Design a protein around this ligand. Sequence first.
Ligand code: HEM
Length: 153
Amino acid sequence: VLSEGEWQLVLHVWAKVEADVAGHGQDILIRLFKSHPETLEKFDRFKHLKTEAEMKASEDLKKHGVTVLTALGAILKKKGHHEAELKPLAQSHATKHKIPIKYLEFISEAIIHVLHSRHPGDFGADAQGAMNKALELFRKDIAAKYKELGYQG
Ligand code: HEM
């Protein structure tokens, strides 16, 4: 569990991801798609995209970024108590989208990368540590639901 000090670091930095949701969203997913191209095979809708310029041009992608970041944000603000917001996500990514838990590790990487890219200033080592910790907690609790369902962590 994170301390109050550590949640304050995470949300104090999210309050500025929240400043431009759509720019952040778009950087994160392009980062994911280029570092692990096998993830793009999960969206039939983004399979046509083949270059980064195509990715940056897609209004559909940008729209999926806002979705991902709005869901994430809602979980983060619930701090240590986020089971209401977490469960539907894990059932759908587990059972609908067939997303392995390894990809959520990939996208947390993506997320920390971009935050450091856009905020070499609120995202020092202490804030990097908090954020790591919040994302592992996210992954841990997801993997627990996956386990239950037979997809397990
Ligand atoms: C930070 C982690 C993630 C968040 C917060 C997130 C959240 C969401 C949300 C809210 C939706 C729409 C409603 C629902 O189906 O739950 C969604 C759909 C989807 N997600 Fe995620 N997601 C995450 C990670 C990913 C990853 C890593 C994959 C793929 C490698 C993935 C693949 C998809 C696909 C296939 C859809 C269905 C809609 C579409 O075709 O884009 N998601 N996700």
